[PDB]
Ligand binder design. Structure first.
Ligand SMILES: N[C@@H](CCC(=O)N[C@@H](CS[C@H]1c2c(cc3ccc4cccc5ccc2c3c45)C(=O)C(=O)[C@@H]1O)C(=O)NCC(=O)O)C(=O)O
Ligand SMILES: N[C@@H](CCC(=O)N[C@@H](CS[C@H]1c2c(cc3ccc4cccc5ccc2c3c45)C(=O)C(=O)[C@@H]1O)C(=O)NCC(=O)O)C(=O)O
Lengths: 222, 222
Protein backbone atom coordinates (compact mmCIF):
# COMPACT_ATOMS: atom_id res chain seq x y z
CA UNK A 1 0.00 0.00 0.00
CA UNK A 2 3.01 2.27 -0.48
CA UNK A 3 2.12 4.86 -3.09
CA UNK A 4 -1.47 5.05 -4.34
CA UNK A 5 -1.66 3.77 -7.96
CA UNK A 6 -3.62 5.88 -10.52
CA UNK A 7 -5.28 3.95 -13.37
CA UNK A 8 -6.13 6.14 -16.34
CA UNK A 9 -5.14 7.11 -19.89
CA UNK A 10 -2.07 9.34 -20.18
CA UNK A 11 -4.07 12.57 -20.23
CA UNK A 12 -5.97 14.98 -17.94
CA UNK A 13 -9.54 13.78 -18.33
CA UNK A 14 -11.27 12.92 -15.07
CA UNK A 15 -8.06 11.82 -13.32
CA UNK A 16 -6.33 15.24 -13.28
CA UNK A 17 -8.38 16.65 -10.36
CA UNK A 18 -7.22 13.64 -8.36
CA UNK A 19 -3.51 14.11 -9.35
CA UNK A 20 -3.92 17.75 -8.22
CA UNK A 21 -5.39 16.77 -4.86
CA UNK A 22 -2.59 14.20 -4.13
CA UNK A 23 0.14 16.61 -5.22
CA UNK A 24 -1.32 19.39 -3.08
CA UNK A 25 -1.39 17.02 -0.08
CA UNK A 26 2.25 16.14 -0.80
CA UNK A 27 1.38 12.52 -1.46
CA UNK A 28 3.66 10.67 -3.88
CA UNK A 29 1.82 8.47 -6.33
CA UNK A 30 2.43 6.09 -9.18
CA UNK A 31 0.54 5.86 -12.44
CA UNK A 32 -0.22 2.90 -14.63
CA UNK A 33 -1.31 4.29 -17.96
CA UNK A 34 -3.92 2.76 -20.18
CA UNK A 35 -2.17 3.03 -23.50
CA UNK A 36 -4.11 0.37 -25.44
CA UNK A 37 -7.72 -0.90 -25.52
CA UNK A 38 -6.11 -4.17 -24.51
CA UNK A 39 -4.84 -2.42 -21.33
CA UNK A 40 -8.40 -1.19 -20.64
CA UNK A 41 -9.83 -4.65 -21.35
CA UNK A 42 -7.48 -6.42 -18.98
CA UNK A 43 -8.50 -4.09 -16.13
CA UNK A 44 -12.20 -4.82 -16.72
CA UNK A 45 -11.84 -8.57 -17.18
CA UNK A 46 -9.60 -8.84 -14.14
CA UNK A 47 -12.44 -7.47 -12.01
CA UNK A 48 -10.55 -4.32 -10.99
CA UNK A 49 -13.19 -1.76 -12.15
CA UNK A 50 -16.53 -1.87 -10.32
CA UNK A 51 -18.38 -0.28 -13.28
CA UNK A 52 -15.75 -1.12 -15.93
CA UNK A 53 -14.58 2.47 -15.86
CA UNK A 54 -11.63 4.65 -14.75
CA UNK A 55 -10.56 6.72 -12.87
CA UNK A 56 -9.62 3.89 -10.55
CA UNK A 57 -7.16 4.27 -7.73
CA UNK A 58 -5.48 1.57 -5.68
CA UNK A 59 -5.21 3.02 -2.20
CA UNK A 60 -5.31 1.45 1.25
CA UNK A 61 -6.20 -1.96 -0.17
CA UNK A 62 -9.12 -0.69 -2.24
CA UNK A 63 -9.78 -0.63 -5.98
CA UNK A 64 -11.64 2.54 -5.80
CA UNK A 65 -13.53 3.74 -8.84
CA UNK A 66 -15.68 6.90 -9.46
CA UNK A 67 -13.92 10.29 -9.43
CA UNK A 68 -16.00 11.79 -6.64
CA UNK A 69 -15.50 8.79 -4.41
CA UNK A 70 -11.72 8.89 -4.95
CA UNK A 71 -11.59 12.67 -4.18
CA UNK A 72 -13.78 12.45 -1.09
CA UNK A 73 -11.63 9.64 0.31
CA UNK A 74 -8.33 11.42 -0.36
CA UNK A 75 -9.72 14.70 0.95
CA UNK A 76 -10.76 13.06 4.23
CA UNK A 77 -7.60 10.98 4.64
CA UNK A 78 -5.37 14.05 4.32
CA UNK A 79 -7.47 16.54 6.27
CA UNK A 80 -8.34 18.63 3.22
CA UNK A 81 -12.11 18.21 3.75
CA UNK A 82 -12.90 20.90 6.30
CA UNK A 83 -13.57 20.36 10.01
CA UNK A 84 -17.26 19.52 10.08
CA UNK A 85 -20.65 18.95 8.43
CA UNK A 86 -21.31 22.60 7.66
CA UNK A 87 -17.87 23.30 6.23
CA UNK A 88 -18.12 20.15 4.07
CA UNK A 89 -21.47 21.44 2.74
CA UNK A 90 -19.83 24.64 1.50
CA UNK A 91 -16.85 22.68 0.26
CA UNK A 92 -19.08 20.24 -1.68
CA UNK A 93 -21.31 22.94 -3.10
CA UNK A 94 -18.30 24.94 -4.32
CA UNK A 95 -16.56 21.87 -5.68
CA UNK A 96 -19.64 20.68 -7.59
CA UNK A 97 -19.88 24.10 -9.23
CA UNK A 98 -16.19 23.85 -10.23
CA UNK A 99 -16.69 20.30 -11.59
CA UNK A 100 -19.61 21.64 -13.61
CA UNK A 101 -17.49 24.53 -14.92
CA UNK A 102 -14.73 22.04 -15.77
CA UNK A 103 -17.09 19.77 -17.71
CA UNK A 104 -18.78 22.64 -19.56
CA UNK A 105 -15.44 23.82 -20.90
CA UNK A 106 -13.86 20.41 -21.44
CA UNK A 107 -16.73 18.88 -23.36
CA UNK A 108 -16.50 21.55 -26.04
CA UNK A 109 -13.87 19.46 -27.86
CA UNK A 110 -16.45 16.68 -28.32
CA UNK A 111 -19.22 18.87 -29.65
CA UNK A 112 -20.46 18.22 -33.18
CA UNK A 113 -18.74 20.85 -35.37
CA UNK A 114 -22.08 22.41 -36.25
CA UNK A 115 -22.94 22.99 -32.56
CA UNK A 116 -19.47 23.99 -31.41
CA UNK A 117 -19.58 27.77 -31.78
CA UNK A 118 -22.89 28.13 -29.96
CA UNK A 119 -21.75 25.78 -27.15
CA UNK A 120 -18.54 27.74 -26.83
CA UNK A 121 -20.39 31.08 -26.61
CA UNK A 122 -22.66 29.68 -23.87
CA UNK A 123 -19.64 28.32 -21.96
CA UNK A 124 -17.88 31.67 -22.07
CA UNK A 125 -21.09 33.38 -20.90
CA UNK A 126 -21.59 30.97 -17.98
CA UNK A 127 -17.94 31.23 -17.01
CA UNK A 128 -17.93 35.02 -16.86
CA UNK A 129 -21.48 35.70 -15.77
CA UNK A 130 -22.31 32.70 -13.54
CA UNK A 131 -19.22 30.91 -12.18
CA UNK A 132 -16.41 33.45 -11.84
CA UNK A 133 -18.67 36.02 -10.19
CA UNK A 134 -19.93 33.33 -7.78
CA UNK A 135 -16.41 32.56 -6.54
CA UNK A 136 -15.22 36.20 -6.53
CA UNK A 137 -18.27 36.81 -4.31
CA UNK A 138 -17.30 34.06 -1.84
CA UNK A 139 -13.77 35.60 -1.41
CA UNK A 140 -15.23 39.10 -1.05
CA UNK A 141 -17.83 38.00 1.47
CA UNK A 142 -15.17 37.05 4.03
CA UNK A 143 -11.89 38.57 2.85
CA UNK A 144 -10.04 35.41 3.77
CA UNK A 145 -7.16 33.81 1.85
CA UNK A 146 -8.99 30.51 1.39
CA UNK A 147 -12.46 29.66 0.14
CA UNK A 148 -13.72 27.92 3.27
CA UNK A 149 -12.83 27.77 6.93
CA UNK A 150 -10.00 30.25 6.68
CA UNK A 151 -7.54 27.41 5.92
CA UNK A 152 -6.55 25.35 2.88
CA UNK A 153 -9.08 22.71 1.82
CA UNK A 154 -9.55 20.57 -1.32
CA UNK A 155 -11.71 23.25 -2.98
CA UNK A 156 -8.90 25.81 -2.97
CA UNK A 157 -6.99 23.30 -5.07
CA UNK A 158 -10.02 22.56 -7.26
CA UNK A 159 -10.49 26.28 -7.88
CA UNK A 160 -6.85 26.91 -8.81
CA UNK A 161 -6.92 23.98 -11.25
CA UNK A 162 -10.09 25.08 -13.04
CA UNK A 163 -8.81 28.71 -13.27
CA UNK A 164 -5.86 27.34 -15.21
CA UNK A 165 -8.26 25.81 -17.72
CA UNK A 166 -10.28 29.01 -17.80
CA UNK A 167 -7.01 30.88 -18.71
CA UNK A 168 -6.32 28.30 -21.46
CA UNK A 169 -9.89 28.64 -22.71
CA UNK A 170 -9.88 32.46 -22.85
CA UNK A 171 -7.44 34.54 -20.84
CA UNK A 172 -9.65 37.61 -20.93
CA UNK A 173 -12.24 35.93 -18.74
CA UNK A 174 -10.22 36.39 -15.57
CA UNK A 175 -9.47 40.09 -15.96
CA UNK A 176 -12.59 41.47 -14.19
CA UNK A 177 -11.95 39.38 -11.09
CA UNK A 178 -9.20 40.83 -8.87
CA UNK A 179 -9.77 38.65 -5.81
CA UNK A 180 -9.60 35.47 -7.90
CA UNK A 181 -6.34 36.67 -9.49
CA UNK A 182 -4.89 37.28 -6.03
CA UNK A 183 -6.16 33.86 -4.94
CA UNK A 184 -4.64 32.13 -8.00
CA UNK A 185 -1.25 33.67 -7.16
CA UNK A 186 -1.51 32.68 -3.53
CA UNK A 187 -2.41 29.09 -4.17
CA UNK A 188 0.18 28.80 -6.92
CA UNK A 189 2.89 29.82 -4.44
CA UNK A 190 2.25 26.93 -2.03
CA UNK A 191 5.34 24.58 -2.09
CA UNK A 192 3.49 21.44 -3.22
CA UNK A 193 1.46 23.36 -5.79
CA UNK A 194 4.44 25.28 -7.19
CA UNK A 195 6.25 21.99 -7.49
CA UNK A 196 3.35 20.38 -9.42
CA UNK A 197 3.18 23.41 -11.71
CA UNK A 198 6.89 23.25 -12.61
CA UNK A 199 8.03 21.29 -15.70
CA UNK A 200 8.70 17.61 -15.08
CA UNK A 201 5.84 16.88 -12.66
CA UNK A 202 2.96 14.43 -13.28
CA UNK A 203 0.72 17.36 -14.20
CA UNK A 204 -0.81 16.70 -17.60
CA UNK A 205 -1.09 18.97 -20.68
CA UNK A 206 -4.27 19.58 -22.75
CA UNK A 207 -4.74 17.20 -25.67
CA UNK A 208 -5.01 18.67 -29.16
CA UNK A 209 -7.61 17.83 -31.86
CA UNK A 210 -5.49 15.20 -33.58
CA UNK A 211 -4.66 13.44 -30.33
CA UNK A 212 -8.26 13.39 -29.13
CA UNK A 213 -9.47 11.97 -32.48
CA UNK A 214 -6.71 9.34 -32.51
CA UNK A 215 -7.09 8.19 -28.92
CA UNK A 216 -10.87 8.17 -28.89
CA UNK A 217 -10.72 6.05 -32.08
CA UNK A 218 -8.44 3.18 -31.07
CA UNK A 219 -10.53 2.57 -27.94
CA UNK A 220 -14.02 2.88 -29.40
CA UNK A 221 -16.50 3.29 -26.49
CA UNK A 222 -20.04 4.70 -26.54
CA UNK B 1 -36.39 26.94 9.87
CA UNK B 2 -37.72 23.60 11.13
CA UNK B 3 -38.67 21.56 8.13
CA UNK B 4 -36.10 21.67 5.30
CA UNK B 5 -37.49 23.57 2.23
CA UNK B 6 -36.91 22.04 -1.24
CA UNK B 7 -36.80 24.44 -4.13
CA UNK B 8 -37.42 22.71 -7.47
CA UNK B 9 -39.81 22.22 -10.40
CA UNK B 10 -42.82 20.01 -9.58
CA UNK B 11 -41.04 16.98 -11.03
CA UNK B 12 -38.49 14.26 -10.25
CA UNK B 13 -35.37 15.58 -11.96
CA UNK B 14 -32.33 16.08 -9.73
CA UNK B 15 -34.39 16.76 -6.62
CA UNK B 16 -36.02 13.32 -6.37
CA UNK B 17 -32.99 11.55 -4.79
CA UNK B 18 -33.16 14.16 -2.02
CA UNK B 19 -36.88 13.75 -1.34
CA UNK B 20 -36.09 10.00 -1.05
CA UNK B 21 -33.21 10.45 1.35
CA UNK B 22 -35.25 12.74 3.58
CA UNK B 23 -38.34 10.52 3.39
CA UNK B 24 -36.24 7.53 4.33
CA UNK B 25 -34.74 9.34 7.33
CA UNK B 26 -38.30 10.12 8.45
CA UNK B 27 -37.59 13.85 8.24
CA UNK B 28 -40.65 15.88 7.20
CA UNK B 29 -40.07 18.52 4.52
CA UNK B 30 -41.87 21.20 2.54
CA UNK B 31 -41.63 22.04 -1.13
CA UNK B 32 -41.79 25.40 -2.91
CA UNK B 33 -42.49 24.57 -6.55
CA UNK B 34 -41.09 26.50 -9.42
CA UNK B 35 -44.18 26.69 -11.58
CA UNK B 36 -43.13 29.35 -14.09
CA UNK B 37 -40.07 31.16 -15.55
CA UNK B 38 -41.00 34.07 -13.33
CA UNK B 39 -40.75 31.94 -10.20
CA UNK B 40 -37.27 30.84 -11.26
CA UNK B 41 -36.18 34.43 -12.08
CA UNK B 42 -37.41 35.60 -8.69
CA UNK B 43 -35.43 32.93 -6.88
CA UNK B 44 -32.30 34.02 -8.73
CA UNK B 45 -32.74 37.82 -8.31
CA UNK B 46 -33.48 37.48 -4.59
CA UNK B 47 -30.09 35.85 -4.00
CA UNK B 48 -31.19 32.30 -3.25
CA UNK B 49 -29.01 30.25 -5.65
CA UNK B 50 -25.23 30.16 -5.54
CA UNK B 51 -24.91 29.19 -9.22
CA UNK B 52 -28.46 30.32 -10.18
CA UNK B 53 -29.55 26.70 -10.26
CA UNK B 54 -31.78 24.28 -8.43
CA UNK B 55 -31.96 21.95 -6.58
CA UNK B 56 -31.57 24.20 -3.60
CA UNK B 57 -32.51 23.18 -0.07
CA UNK B 58 -33.00 25.52 2.91
CA UNK B 59 -31.73 23.69 5.95
CA UNK B 60 -29.96 24.63 9.17
CA UNK B 61 -29.55 28.26 8.09
CA UNK B 62 -28.08 27.42 4.72
CA UNK B 63 -29.43 27.90 1.25
CA UNK B 64 -27.67 24.81 0.00
CA UNK B 65 -27.36 24.18 -3.74
CA UNK B 66 -25.81 21.31 -5.79
CA UNK B 67 -27.50 17.91 -5.60
CA UNK B 68 -24.46 16.06 -4.25
CA UNK B 69 -23.71 18.75 -1.65
CA UNK B 70 -27.28 18.54 -0.37
CA UNK B 71 -27.23 14.73 -0.33
CA UNK B 72 -23.88 14.60 1.54
CA UNK B 73 -25.12 16.96 4.24
CA UNK B 74 -28.47 15.23 4.83
CA UNK B 75 -26.77 11.76 4.85
CA UNK B 76 -24.26 12.91 7.49
CA UNK B 77 -26.88 14.72 9.56
CA UNK B 78 -29.17 11.71 9.78
CA UNK B 79 -26.52 9.00 10.21
CA UNK B 80 -27.04 7.49 6.73
CA UNK B 81 -23.43 7.96 5.70
CA UNK B 82 -21.79 4.91 7.29
CA UNK B 83 -19.33 5.10 10.21
CA UNK B 84 -15.93 5.96 8.72
CA UNK B 85 -14.01 7.03 5.65
CA UNK B 86 -13.69 3.49 4.37
CA UNK B 87 -17.43 2.76 4.48
CA UNK B 88 -18.00 6.19 2.88
CA UNK B 89 -15.55 5.28 0.09
CA UNK B 90 -17.81 2.25 -0.74
CA UNK B 91 -21.03 4.28 -0.23
CA UNK B 92 -19.70 7.04 -2.53
CA UNK B 93 -18.50 4.66 -5.30
CA UNK B 94 -21.86 2.80 -5.22
CA UNK B 95 -23.85 6.04 -5.17
CA UNK B 96 -21.97 7.51 -8.14
CA UNK B 97 -22.59 4.40 -10.26
CA UNK B 98 -26.29 4.64 -9.34
CA UNK B 99 -26.40 8.35 -10.26
CA UNK B 100 -24.68 7.51 -13.57
CA UNK B 101 -27.27 4.80 -14.24
CA UNK B 102 -30.11 7.19 -13.40
CA UNK B 103 -28.84 9.80 -15.85
CA UNK B 104 -28.19 7.30 -18.58
CA UNK B 105 -31.82 6.03 -18.50
CA UNK B 106 -33.29 9.50 -17.72
CA UNK B 107 -31.56 11.16 -20.70
CA UNK B 108 -33.33 8.94 -23.25
CA UNK B 109 -36.48 11.13 -23.37
CA UNK B 110 -34.31 13.98 -24.73
CA UNK B 111 -32.75 11.99 -27.60
CA UNK B 112 -33.84 13.11 -31.07
CA UNK B 113 -35.73 10.14 -32.62
CA UNK B 114 -32.88 9.32 -35.00
CA UNK B 115 -30.66 8.76 -31.95
CA UNK B 116 -33.09 7.49 -29.33
CA UNK B 117 -33.28 3.87 -30.55
CA UNK B 118 -29.53 3.25 -30.46
CA UNK B 119 -29.17 5.21 -27.22
CA UNK B 120 -31.94 3.07 -25.76
CA UNK B 121 -30.25 -0.16 -26.74
CA UNK B 122 -27.00 1.07 -25.24
CA UNK B 123 -28.77 2.01 -22.01
CA UNK B 124 -30.36 -1.46 -21.74
CA UNK B 125 -27.08 -3.26 -22.47
CA UNK B 126 -25.32 -1.12 -19.82
CA UNK B 127 -28.13 -1.70 -17.31
CA UNK B 128 -28.13 -5.46 -17.44
CA UNK B 129 -24.49 -6.10 -18.19
CA UNK B 130 -22.66 -3.40 -16.29
CA UNK B 131 -24.79 -1.84 -13.56
CA UNK B 132 -27.15 -4.53 -12.22
CA UNK B 133 -24.47 -7.22 -12.17
CA UNK B 134 -22.26 -4.84 -10.17
CA UNK B 135 -24.82 -4.43 -7.38
CA UNK B 136 -25.97 -8.04 -7.49
CA UNK B 137 -22.25 -8.76 -6.94
CA UNK B 138 -21.94 -6.53 -3.86
CA UNK B 139 -24.96 -8.19 -2.26
CA UNK B 140 -23.47 -11.62 -2.98
CA UNK B 141 -20.04 -10.69 -1.66
CA UNK B 142 -21.27 -10.44 1.94
CA UNK B 143 -24.71 -12.03 1.90
CA UNK B 144 -25.99 -9.22 4.14
CA UNK B 145 -29.34 -7.35 3.92
CA UNK B 146 -27.79 -3.94 3.20
CA UNK B 147 -25.17 -2.77 0.70
CA UNK B 148 -22.63 -1.44 3.22
CA UNK B 149 -21.79 -2.03 6.84
CA UNK B 150 -24.72 -4.40 7.40
CA UNK B 151 -26.81 -1.31 8.28
CA UNK B 152 -29.15 0.90 6.35
CA UNK B 153 -27.21 3.71 4.59
CA UNK B 154 -28.07 6.36 2.00
CA UNK B 155 -27.01 4.01 -0.79
CA UNK B 156 -29.63 1.37 0.04
CA UNK B 157 -32.19 4.14 -0.56
CA UNK B 158 -30.44 5.30 -3.75
CA UNK B 159 -30.36 1.73 -5.04
CA UNK B 160 -34.11 1.17 -4.31
CA UNK B 161 -34.97 4.41 -6.10
CA UNK B 162 -32.99 3.60 -9.25
CA UNK B 163 -34.41 0.04 -9.26
CA UNK B 164 -37.84 1.68 -9.58
CA UNK B 165 -36.69 3.64 -12.62
CA UNK B 166 -35.17 0.54 -14.17
CA UNK B 167 -38.47 -1.27 -13.57
CA UNK B 168 -40.31 1.58 -15.38
CA UNK B 169 -37.81 1.52 -18.21
CA UNK B 170 -37.98 -2.27 -18.82
CA UNK B 171 -39.14 -4.70 -16.16
CA UNK B 172 -37.49 -7.74 -17.71
CA UNK B 173 -34.13 -6.15 -16.89
CA UNK B 174 -34.46 -7.05 -13.21
CA UNK B 175 -35.56 -10.67 -13.59
CA UNK B 176 -32.05 -12.19 -13.89
CA UNK B 177 -31.04 -10.78 -10.48
CA UNK B 178 -32.54 -12.63 -7.53
CA UNK B 179 -30.51 -10.79 -4.86
CA UNK B 180 -31.54 -7.37 -6.21
CA UNK B 181 -35.18 -8.50 -6.24
CA UNK B 182 -34.99 -9.55 -2.55
CA UNK B 183 -33.21 -6.31 -1.65
CA UNK B 184 -35.97 -4.30 -3.39
CA UNK B 185 -38.76 -5.95 -1.35
CA UNK B 186 -36.82 -5.61 1.83
CA UNK B 187 -36.06 -1.89 1.54
CA UNK B 188 -39.60 -1.29 0.28
CA UNK B 189 -40.90 -2.76 3.50
CA UNK B 190 -39.19 -0.27 5.82
CA UNK B 191 -41.82 1.94 7.54
CA UNK B 192 -40.56 5.27 6.14
CA UNK B 193 -40.03 3.87 2.67
CA UNK B 194 -43.47 2.23 2.60
CA UNK B 195 -44.93 5.63 3.62
CA UNK B 196 -43.09 7.35 0.73
CA UNK B 197 -44.09 4.68 -1.78
CA UNK B 198 -47.78 4.95 -1.08
CA UNK B 199 -50.11 7.40 -2.81
CA UNK B 200 -50.22 10.93 -1.56
CA UNK B 201 -46.55 11.25 -0.50
CA UNK B 202 -44.15 13.83 -2.00
CA UNK B 203 -42.71 11.19 -4.30
CA UNK B 204 -42.89 12.32 -7.97
CA UNK B 205 -44.08 10.53 -11.14
CA UNK B 206 -42.17 10.12 -14.38
CA UNK B 207 -42.66 12.54 -17.24
CA UNK B 208 -42.99 11.40 -20.85
CA UNK B 209 -41.23 13.28 -23.70
CA UNK B 210 -44.48 15.18 -24.41
CA UNK B 211 -44.48 16.55 -20.89
CA UNK B 212 -40.74 17.31 -21.14
CA UNK B 213 -40.98 19.23 -24.42
CA UNK B 214 -43.92 21.17 -23.05
CA UNK B 215 -42.35 22.28 -19.74
CA UNK B 216 -38.82 22.61 -21.04
CA UNK B 217 -40.32 24.97 -23.63
CA UNK B 218 -41.79 27.64 -21.36
CA UNK B 219 -38.51 28.25 -19.59
CA UNK B 220 -36.25 28.18 -22.61
CA UNK B 221 -33.27 27.31 -20.41
CA UNK B 222 -29.93 26.70 -22.15
N1 LIG C 1 -18.93 8.94 -13.32
C1 LIG C 1 -17.64 8.27 -13.64
C2 LIG C 1 -17.35 8.32 -15.13
C3 LIG C 1 -16.25 7.37 -15.56
C4 LIG C 1 -16.01 7.36 -17.07
O1 LIG C 1 -16.80 7.88 -17.86
N2 LIG C 1 -14.88 6.77 -17.44
C5 LIG C 1 -14.47 6.62 -18.83
C6 LIG C 1 -13.17 7.41 -19.08
S1 LIG C 1 -13.30 9.22 -18.87
C7 LIG C 1 -13.99 9.81 -20.45
C8 LIG C 1 -13.33 9.07 -21.65
C9 LIG C 1 -14.11 8.19 -22.51
C10 LIG C 1 -13.46 7.47 -23.59
C11 LIG C 1 -12.07 7.66 -23.84
C12 LIG C 1 -11.42 6.94 -24.90
C13 LIG C 1 -10.03 7.16 -25.18
C14 LIG C 1 -9.27 8.13 -24.41
C15 LIG C 1 -7.89 8.37 -24.69
C16 LIG C 1 -7.15 9.35 -23.93
C17 LIG C 1 -7.79 10.07 -22.89
C18 LIG C 1 -9.17 9.84 -22.58
C19 LIG C 1 -9.81 10.56 -21.53
C20 LIG C 1 -11.17 10.30 -21.21
C21 LIG C 1 -11.93 9.30 -21.94
C22 LIG C 1 -11.31 8.60 -23.03
C23 LIG C 1 -9.92 8.86 -23.34
C24 LIG C 1 -15.61 8.00 -22.26
O2 LIG C 1 -15.88 7.00 -21.57
C25 LIG C 1 -16.17 9.09 -21.84
O3 LIG C 1 -16.15 9.97 -22.71
C26 LIG C 1 -15.57 9.65 -20.47
O4 LIG C 1 -16.15 10.94 -20.21
C27 LIG C 1 -14.28 5.13 -19.12
O5 LIG C 1 -13.66 4.42 -18.32
N3 LIG C 1 -14.84 4.66 -20.24
C28 LIG C 1 -14.76 3.26 -20.68
C29 LIG C 1 -16.11 2.56 -20.84
O6 LIG C 1 -17.15 3.23 -20.66
O7 LIG C 1 -16.17 1.35 -21.15
C30 LIG C 1 -16.48 8.92 -12.87
O8 LIG C 1 -16.59 10.15 -12.65
O9 LIG C 1 -15.50 8.26 -12.51
N1 LIG D 1 -24.66 20.10 -10.94
C1 LIG D 1 -25.96 20.73 -10.54
C2 LIG D 1 -26.87 20.92 -11.76
C3 LIG D 1 -28.02 21.89 -11.50
C4 LIG D 1 -28.89 22.14 -12.72
O1 LIG D 1 -28.51 21.81 -13.85
N2 LIG D 1 -30.05 22.74 -12.48
C5 LIG D 1 -31.02 23.08 -13.52
C6 LIG D 1 -32.31 22.26 -13.38
S1 LIG D 1 -32.12 20.46 -13.53
C7 LIG D 1 -32.21 20.14 -15.36
C8 LIG D 1 -33.33 21.00 -16.00
C9 LIG D 1 -33.01 22.05 -16.96
C10 LIG D 1 -34.05 22.92 -17.47
C11 LIG D 1 -35.40 22.71 -17.08
C12 LIG D 1 -36.44 23.59 -17.57
C13 LIG D 1 -37.81 23.35 -17.21
C14 LIG D 1 -38.16 22.23 -16.40
C15 LIG D 1 -39.53 21.97 -16.08
C16 LIG D 1 -39.88 20.85 -15.28
C17 LIG D 1 -38.87 19.95 -14.78
C18 LIG D 1 -37.49 20.20 -15.07
C19 LIG D 1 -36.48 19.33 -14.56
C20 LIG D 1 -35.10 19.60 -14.84
C21 LIG D 1 -34.72 20.75 -15.65
C22 LIG D 1 -35.75 21.60 -16.20
C23 LIG D 1 -37.12 21.34 -15.90
C24 LIG D 1 -31.57 22.29 -17.40
O2 LIG D 1 -31.00 23.21 -16.78
C25 LIG D 1 -30.90 21.19 -17.43
O3 LIG D 1 -31.37 20.42 -18.29
C26 LIG D 1 -30.80 20.45 -16.01
O4 LIG D 1 -30.07 19.22 -16.14
C27 LIG D 1 -31.35 24.56 -13.39
O5 LIG D 1 -31.60 25.03 -12.28
N3 LIG D 1 -31.33 25.28 -14.51
C28 LIG D 1 -31.61 26.72 -14.59
C29 LIG D 1 -30.50 27.54 -15.26
O6 LIG D 1 -29.46 26.95 -15.64
O7 LIG D 1 -30.65 28.76 -15.43
C30 LIG D 1 -26.70 19.93 -9.47
O8 LIG D 1 -26.56 18.69 -9.50
O9 LIG D 1 -27.39 20.50 -8.62
Amino acid sequence: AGKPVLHYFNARGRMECIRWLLAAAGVEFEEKFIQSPEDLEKLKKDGNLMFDQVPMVEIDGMKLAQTRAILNYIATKYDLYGKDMKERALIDMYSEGILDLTEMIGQLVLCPPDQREAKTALAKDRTKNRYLPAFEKVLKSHGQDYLVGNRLTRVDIHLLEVLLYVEEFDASLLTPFPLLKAFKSRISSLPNVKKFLQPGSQRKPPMDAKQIQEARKAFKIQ
